[PDB]
Amino acid sequence: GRVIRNQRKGAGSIFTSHTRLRQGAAKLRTLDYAERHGYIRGIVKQIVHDSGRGAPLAKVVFRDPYKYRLREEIFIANEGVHTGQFIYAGKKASLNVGNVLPLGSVPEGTIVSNVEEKPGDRGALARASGNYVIIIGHNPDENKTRVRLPSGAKKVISSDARGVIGVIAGGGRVDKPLLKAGRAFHKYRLKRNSWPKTRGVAMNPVDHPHGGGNHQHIGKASTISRGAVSGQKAGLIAARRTGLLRG
Amino acid sequence: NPLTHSTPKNFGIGQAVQPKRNLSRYVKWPEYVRVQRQKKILSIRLKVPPTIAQFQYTLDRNTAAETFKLFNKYRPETAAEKKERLTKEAAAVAEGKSKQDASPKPYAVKYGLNHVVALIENKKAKLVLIANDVDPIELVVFLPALCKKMGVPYAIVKGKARLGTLVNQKTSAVAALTEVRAEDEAALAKLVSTIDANFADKYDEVKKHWGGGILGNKAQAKMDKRAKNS
Amino acid sequence: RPRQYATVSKTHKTVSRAYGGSRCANCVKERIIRAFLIEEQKIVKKVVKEQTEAAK
Amino acid sequence: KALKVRTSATFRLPKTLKLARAPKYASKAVPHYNRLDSYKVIEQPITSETAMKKVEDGNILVFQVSMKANKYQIKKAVKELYEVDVLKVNTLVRPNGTKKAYVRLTADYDALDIANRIGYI
Amino acid sequence: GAYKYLEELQRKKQSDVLRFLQRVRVWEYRQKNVIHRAARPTRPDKARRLGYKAKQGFVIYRVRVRRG
RNA sequence: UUAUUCAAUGAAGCGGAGCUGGAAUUCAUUUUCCACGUUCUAGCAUUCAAGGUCCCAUUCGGGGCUGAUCCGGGUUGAAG
RNA sequence: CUAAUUAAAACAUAGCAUUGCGAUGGUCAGAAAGUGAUGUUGACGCAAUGUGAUUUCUGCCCAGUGCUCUGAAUGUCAAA
RNA sequence: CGUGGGUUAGUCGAUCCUAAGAGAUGGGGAAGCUCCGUUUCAAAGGCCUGAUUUUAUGCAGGCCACCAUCGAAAGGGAAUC
Ligand SMILES: [Mg+2]
Ligand SMILES: [Mg+2]
Ligand SMILES: [Mg+2]
Ligand SMILES: [Mg+2]
Ligand SMILES: [Mg+2]
Ligand SMILES: [Mg+2]
Ligand SMILES: [Mg+2]
Ligand SMILES: [Mg+2]
Ligand SMILES: [Mg+2]
Ligand SMILES: [Mg+2]
Ligand SMILES: [Mg+2]
Ligand SMILES: [Mg+2]
Ligand SMILES: [Mg+2]
Ligand SMILES: [Mg+2]
Ligand SMILES: [Mg+2]
Ligand SMILES: [Mg+2]
Ligand SMILES: [Mg+2]
Ligand SMILES: [Mg+2]
Ligand SMILES: [Mg+2]
Ligand SMILES: [Mg+2]
Ligand SMILES: [Mg+2]
Ligand SMILES: [Mg+2]
Ligand SMILES: [Mg+2]
Ligand SMILES: [Mg+2]
Ligand SMILES: [Mg+2]
Ligand SMILES: [Mg+2]
Ligand SMILES: [Mg+2]
Ligand SMILES: [Mg+2]
Ligand SMILES: [Mg+2]
Ligand SMILES: [Mg+2]
Ligand SMILES: [Mg+2]
Ligand SMILES: [Mg+2]
Ligand SMILES: [Mg+2]
Ligand SMILES: [Mg+2]
Ligand SMILES: [Mg+2]
Ligand SMILES: [Mg+2]
Ligand SMILES: [Mg+2]
Ligand SMILES: [Mg+2]
Ligand SMILES: [Mg+2]
Ligand SMILES: [Mg+2]
Ligand SMILES: [Mg+2]
Ligand SMILES: [Mg+2]
């Protein structure tokens, strides 16, 4: 009869993300006239490390088109992007790794990253390290582009949505064992409080639906309805199937 | 001058920071400005039932200039001349002693909504000017129908401010003539003949026509663009 | 320390070159050379683009 | 239909004229007198033996002063209550909650002479 | 005078004219603050019969409350 | 689409018309279209902009216009 | 780690595996909201679980119960 | 226990700055006590004139698109031996 650990996560007190050492939000440049009609040249100044993020972050300086000053945009660095490299962003930009282009102005089978779902949301898709979006189709009439997502999902998005050529740098990061609890400790120390995880079968019945009993066991099906309520969704929620991928 | 030289700046994309241009189309206006422009927009976007927007069919500048030229010969008394003729009437009560009546009959425009509606209902108004800018419009919306039923000629005219100018108010919302002097019968007869031509002899057809349904600039452009495409 | 710089004279805070107390005499040399060869490349690009647009 | 050329897309609130106040009636009808004059600033001398040593040797007059009085007010009140020059004023709040000023006089003045003019030691 | 006409015309709410006026006005008041000052009564005859006089000392405020 | 909804921005360039060139083989008509000044390089880009043109009533300086095309005042997009 | 009777074989752990979710979304807050946590996030990610380093293996059973499925649309069916 | 005496700062600290965070306003919610929110969907703003006699300097141009405030006697910080 006690509020369980996943229900306490939404109150956001000790389960907030640890955001002191992060460099800022990584976004694309704002979709302005220069990117909508031509291109703009920025410069990679630093490739830095973002805390909690597996991917390195490029700091790219553009000239402000309407005032005399410099705008520093924070990009997710694509693999091969180097300091001092010019980055071109706009409809008329070229097919180079690091360049920011609308997806309608881009051929088929092109690998892109930091892809807007809607034109002007400044980067939504394929942002984690090593991830990319394949362009798998164009529907020029009532402009739409079919893309393939890193989960394998096909998705039709707008041709005016912008992506960045290349894959996200930092790939292969989950290819290393952590080997030890301290490396997971320092990994999650700058993400958020979600580790270590006590199992619900190891708790009392007051703490979890899986809690209690004279042996640690579940006792009802771990598969939970989508139409179940908070406190009940502790297991394999709305599972179409279970078990190993074996035919 | 050989010391001067021509630079010319390249205000393209990606070169030579843009000059000061007119950005008045892009101004984030205050909310009262935005809502008063968008109210005007919405009231003509929607289909307008024919009872309202028989307004904006207005007495145009020429016949309205003639109408105000006649109506400004019948301006009501200011406070100054009322104070003058009250002292003159007090002197008349002192020595003249007709009854109380040294003052003549006054010939003034009739204003005030209840008063002019009473005059129309008693068939005393010879001409009713109705402001087209009255808000709420429900105050004056029944007046073409009541004027038409009583046979009073009405003109919908621009300016509750402008009617207020001749009745010495700020806003008047109506003005009426119920009797004019001997010199102005011909002018009132010409004005009634053109005003009934514009308003009361068109009223049967104007009762049927819905107003509004006006597309915007871009919606009219893409409305005729796909007409060309078809 | 940063507020001690308001007490010393301009000489201690500056080198007598362009970008004196900001850049490091090799980055200054690099940016002079980069400037000059890029305007020379700009006028070569201008003449070449004018020739290929006036010839075809 | 000429319209103002706006080179900015931000509307700001216009700088309207501000009138100063011009009241029909006075706010409190009598200005208060000096709430900390010199007779308020200086309460009394301190005649502890430790203070008398400072008078006889260091040329410091030791006073109990008002709790509201800063070192400027102590210096001004000493300067026109005893007609002396003040080199320095040092001040402490005592543990019994009253203020004490060690007023060091300029070497043109003898604190022993001034203290015997006042009436203590 | 005109207040009797206003009285009888306010009861025809699902007429075309009051439906148009209702829609333009419900957009207008929703674009304002939840409580705001009205410069004048939009139902002046209802204000007469509820006690408002048009003189200095009487104030109209328009207010919107959530339903349900 | 105008209510409602979502989104973004220092609400900056939206929409519609406007010079040429042509693989429109000018068919004597923009039934008809595209391109709107920037890609070797970790430089630089700000003073209502120089230029050109017109007026001040000239005062060692100032004001227009064009440079920088008009028109609609729908900030722009999505959704309905 | 059971402060003050249980320091363990219990819990955690790396490793393994399963599940949900491509954002007007998953999971979770809040009486409501023009409100929130994850989220300065985007599937090498977040969220929910189980098992518990390495080695070697993980057999059979979809009847029951749960979960799930553009699945059948005159079986049942409320308000209007 | 009774009676007094004693704490002196331009330089040591606080004061100031921001931190995790707390929190007004604008605005929305809530029967309401109050809740949310912290730059948001607000008409949110005060600074020098290049140096002086028609100037309590302004009734001159001109610039800034920032947005309460609180929050560390171990963090940052003007200066004494
Ligand atoms: Mg509890
Ligand atoms: Mg609880
Ligand atoms: Mg949990
Ligand atoms: Mg946070
Ligand atoms: Mg964790
Ligand atoms: Mg685990
Ligand atoms: Mg576990
Ligand atoms: Mg237990
Ligand atoms: Mg137990
Ligand atoms: Mg339970
Ligand atoms: Mg159990
Ligand atoms: Mg077990
Ligand atoms: Mg279930
Ligand atoms: Mg307002
Ligand atoms: Mg006053
Ligand atoms: Mg002190
Ligand atoms: Mg009454
Ligand atoms: Mg009033
Ligand atoms: Mg509508
Ligand atoms: Mg815009
Ligand atoms: Mg205990
Ligand atoms: Mg114990
Ligand atoms: Mg133990
Ligand atoms: Mg023990
Ligand atoms: Mg246990
Ligand atoms: Mg957050
Ligand atoms: Mg264990
Ligand atoms: Mg084992
Ligand atoms: Mg089974
Ligand atoms: Mg039924
Ligand atoms: Mg004692
Ligand atoms: Mg004692
Ligand atoms: Mg100090
Ligand atoms: Mg602060
Ligand atoms: Mg609060
Ligand atoms: Mg509210
Ligand atoms: Mg406080
Ligand atoms: Mg503070
Ligand atoms: Mg400190
Ligand atoms: Mg530090
Ligand atoms: Mg410190
Ligand atoms: Mg300090």
PDB file of C-alpha atoms in Angstrom, chain C:
ATOM      1  CA  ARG C   1      45.184  38.484 -10.597  1.00  0.00           C
ATOM      2  CA  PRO C   2      42.417  40.116 -12.687  1.00  0.00           C
ATOM      3  CA  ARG C   3      41.727  43.234 -10.615  1.00  0.00           C
ATOM      4  CA  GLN C   4      45.457  43.952 -10.358  1.00  0.00           C
ATOM      5  CA  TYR C   5      45.433  44.700 -14.102  1.00  0.00           C
ATOM      6  CA  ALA C   6      43.558  47.941 -13.413  1.00  0.00           C
ATOM      7  CA  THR C   7      46.523  49.197 -11.352  1.00  0.00           C
ATOM      8  CA  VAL C   8      49.443  48.639 -13.734  1.00  0.00           C
ATOM      9  CA  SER C   9      50.257  50.742 -16.775  1.00  0.00           C
ATOM     10  CA  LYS C  10      49.329  49.941 -20.373  1.00  0.00           C
ATOM     11  CA  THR C  11      52.869  48.701 -21.132  1.00  0.00           C
ATOM     12  CA  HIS C  12      52.614  45.651 -18.864  1.00  0.00           C
ATOM     13  CA  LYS C  13      49.281  44.683 -20.459  1.00  0.00           C
ATOM     14  CA  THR C  14      50.150  45.086 -24.150  1.00  0.00           C
ATOM     15  CA  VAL C  15      52.643  44.092 -26.850  1.00  0.00           C
ATOM     16  CA  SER C  16      53.355  46.882 -29.350  1.00  0.00           C
ATOM     17  CA  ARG C  17      52.030  44.831 -32.296  1.00  0.00           C
ATOM     18  CA  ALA C  18      48.526  44.589 -33.735  1.00  0.00           C
ATOM     19  CA  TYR C  19      46.493  42.242 -31.498  1.00  0.00           C
ATOM     20  CA  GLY C  20      49.248  42.833 -28.957  1.00  0.00           C
ATOM     21  CA  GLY C  21      47.909  41.576 -25.650  1.00  0.00           C
ATOM     22  CA  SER C  22      45.298  39.271 -27.232  1.00  0.00           C
ATOM     23  CA  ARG C  23      47.136  37.058 -29.766  1.00  0.00           C
ATOM     24  CA  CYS C  24      50.545  35.494 -29.793  1.00  0.00           C
ATOM     25  CA  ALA C  25      52.674  36.744 -32.799  1.00  0.00           C
ATOM     26  CA  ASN C  26      52.241  33.515 -34.719  1.00  0.00           C
ATOM     27  CA  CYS C  27      48.460  33.628 -34.797  1.00  0.00           C
ATOM     28  CA  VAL C  28      48.851  37.304 -35.773  1.00  0.00           C
ATOM     29  CA  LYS C  29      51.218  36.339 -38.601  1.00  0.00           C
ATOM     30  CA  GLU C  30      48.865  33.535 -39.645  1.00  0.00           C
ATOM     31  CA  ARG C  31      45.879  35.875 -39.775  1.00  0.00           C
ATOM     32  CA  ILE C  32      47.754  38.562 -41.778  1.00  0.00           C
ATOM     33  CA  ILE C  33      48.868  35.935 -44.295  1.00  0.00           C
ATOM     34  CA  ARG C  34      45.408  34.318 -44.383  1.00  0.00           C
ATOM     35  CA  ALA C  35      43.815  37.725 -44.955  1.00  0.00           C
ATOM     36  CA  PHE C  36      46.163  38.774 -47.773  1.00  0.00           C
ATOM     37  CA  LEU C  37      46.086  35.541 -49.752  1.00  0.00           C
ATOM     38  CA  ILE C  38      42.320  35.343 -49.412  1.00  0.00           C
ATOM     39  CA  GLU C  39      41.779  38.826 -50.959  1.00  0.00           C
ATOM     40  CA  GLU C  40      44.223  37.871 -53.721  1.00  0.00           C
ATOM     41  CA  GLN C  41      42.222  34.672 -54.208  1.00  0.00           C
ATOM     42  CA  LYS C  42      39.055  36.796 -54.172  1.00  0.00           C
ATOM     43  CA  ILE C  43      40.209  38.981 -57.056  1.00  0.00           C
ATOM     44  CA  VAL C  44      41.427  35.916 -59.003  1.00  0.00           C
ATOM     45  CA  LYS C  45      38.001  34.326 -58.395  1.00  0.00           C
ATOM     46  CA  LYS C  46      36.316  37.582 -59.467  1.00  0.00           C
ATOM     47  CA  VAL C  47      38.263  37.821 -62.732  1.00  0.00           C
ATOM     48  CA  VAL C  48      37.842  34.093 -63.493  1.00  0.00           C
ATOM     49  CA  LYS C  49      34.078  34.161 -62.812  1.00  0.00           C
ATOM     50  CA  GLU C  50      33.736  37.332 -64.905  1.00  0.00           C
ATOM     51  CA  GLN C  51      35.657  35.690 -67.765  1.00  0.00           C
ATOM     52  CA  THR C  52      33.611  32.481 -67.681  1.00  0.00           C
ATOM     53  CA  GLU C  53      30.363  34.495 -67.550  1.00  0.00           C
ATOM     54  CA  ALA C  54      31.417  36.899 -70.336  1.00  0.00           C
ATOM     55  CA  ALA C  55      32.685  34.071 -72.572  1.00  0.00           C
ATOM     56  CA  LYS C  56      29.660  31.751 -72.311  1.00  0.00           C
TER      57      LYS C  56
END
